[PDB]
Structure 1
């Protein structure tokens, strides 16, 4: 019924966002299928660019994060604007505001909320508040591979893993990976575990097939909370 979609910041760094016209139909799709969708956008290059500039002039860490949040919010406005008619036209700046906005029965798009965390924590918090039992993380890769792609030749996709692995990475005993990196946040892990939120890592080029994803008729990796 309720689902949260986390769009990696990378999505906003490519030549275009035509994928949004797709997501737009994907959302209409999911919609007609009796599925409500919440969306969280990352900061991408715009955030890294402003954070770096602010760091070179002495800005404190708290404020660097705020600039990353405002960048992620600019991406949320872009998405919200492409979803006219389907979305509640307001970007909540905190989880409490999200709860109010979600209260309107339409799609809600959000950026970051608070310093000291990434948008993955946001997507987790929002999935919990909206009683979403499934969080879909859309990044620029098909899913989680048994071994780091770019490093090791021809690797296969892991059909599923547990949250315990995401933290085995945060330690340093398991190499990060594009697709696992999008979820390396303790609060995110704590939230998906305490609320037992299933996480699906997939490629944002497959949004047109997100329903197949939710069914299993399509490539991706499932992170099961434990």
Structure 2
């Protein structure tokens, strides 16, 4: 079926050929398992770096967001140019445009759409519009934690939880599933799989629940 893959921005800040090489194989691996793949790429450091520079000279919040969006699109193009042929050569700039590009039956790579949200929201929207039952959020963490492994000791990894639990835990910045994202995944009952992009090579396993991952169930 259809599946949306949200690649965290950090993924591009790293500068190591192996990242793209592996993401590319996994996009193929997912393909050879009868999977249509949509990919959303975040802005990463390029985004933050420009948002800061822009903010420094007083650029309004709306425009700071656009800069982050454009930065996320630059990453989108990078992913796409390595997916060449395999992907539809256009980076939709709105959900409506995505819906169109998705018609062509190839992989579609997206960046941001609108100010006031994050690529997480985009991933949700795109997942909903593409009838994807699963939204994989590949980030630099292994999964979801009750508090924060960085600041609290032995906060064991929650391999399963609902949009309710994730709400209490979370109870241009973000989260991982900002408000709009959660709202969308819930109304369209899309399950979110948080995993480490280091394991994109074991995505097929992740999807069928055989590897370190956190699955958020809609409720």
In the superposition, the TM-score normalised over structure 1's length comes to 0.92
* Residue 144 (structure 1) shift: 1.1
146 and 62 in structure 1: CA distance in 2 versus 1, 3 angstrom threshold: closer
Contact (CA 8 Å) 1:166, 1:183: kept in 2 or not? Answer: no
* Residue 182 (structure 1) shift: 4.3
Structure 1 distance, partners of 2:165, 2:117, is 19
Contact (CA 8 Å) 2:137, 2:192: kept in 1 or not? Answer: yes
Runs of at least 5 residues in structure 2 that lack an aligned partner in the other structure: none
Offset from partner CA, 1:148-194 (integer Å, 9 cap, x none): 211223332111111123322443xxxxxxx9964241110110000
Q: Secondary structure in 2 aligned to 1:182?
A: coil
Contact (CA 8 Å) 1:76, 1:91: kept in 2 or not? Answer: yes
Do residues 151 (structure 1) and 151 (structure 2) align?
Answer: yes
Q: Which residue of 2 aligns with 1:197?
A: 190
Contact (CA 8 Å) 1:11, 1:17: kept in 2 or not? Answer: no
In the superposition, the TM-score normalised over structure 2's length comes to 0.95
213 and 182 in structure 1: CA distance in 2 versus 1, 3 angstrom threshold: farther
Contact (CA 8 Å) 1:120, 1:185: kept in 2 or not? Answer: yes
Q: Which residue of 2 aligns with 1:100?
A: 100
* Residue 54 (structure 1) shift: 0.7
Moved more, 142-151 or 41-50: 142-151
Offset from partner CA, 1:194-222 (integer Å, 9 cap, x none): 00000000000000000000011111001
Moved more, 27-36 or 64-73: 27-36
RMSD of the alignment, in Å?
Answer: 1.9
Structure 2 distance, partners of 1:98, 1:145, is 32
Contact (CA 8 Å) 2:162, 2:216: kept in 1 or not? Answer: yes
Offset from partner CA, 1:44-63 (integer Å, 9 cap, x none): 11111101111111111100
Contact (CA 8 Å) 1:144, 1:180: kept in 2 or not? Answer: no
Contact (CA 8 Å) 2:194, 2:213: kept in 1 or not? Answer: yes
17 and 41 in structure 1: CA distance in 2 versus 1, 3 angstrom threshold: farther
Offset from partner CA, 1:80-110 (integer Å, 9 cap, x none): 0111121011100000010010101000000
37 and 184 in structure 1: CA distance in 2 versus 1, 3 angstrom threshold: closer
Moved more, 10-19 or 65-74: 10-19
* Residue 6 (structure 1) shift: 0.2
* Residue 29 (structure 1) shift: 1.1
Q: Secondary structure in 2 aligned to 1:208?
A: helix
Alignment of 1:69-148 (within 5 A): 69-148=69-148
Runs of at least 5 residues in structure 1 that lack an aligned partner in the other structure: 172-178
Moved more, 143-152 or 51-60: 143-152
Structure 2 distance, partners of 1:10, 1:165, is 25
Moved more, 23-32 or 118-127: 23-32
Contact (CA 8 Å) 1:72, 1:112: kept in 2 or not? Answer: yes
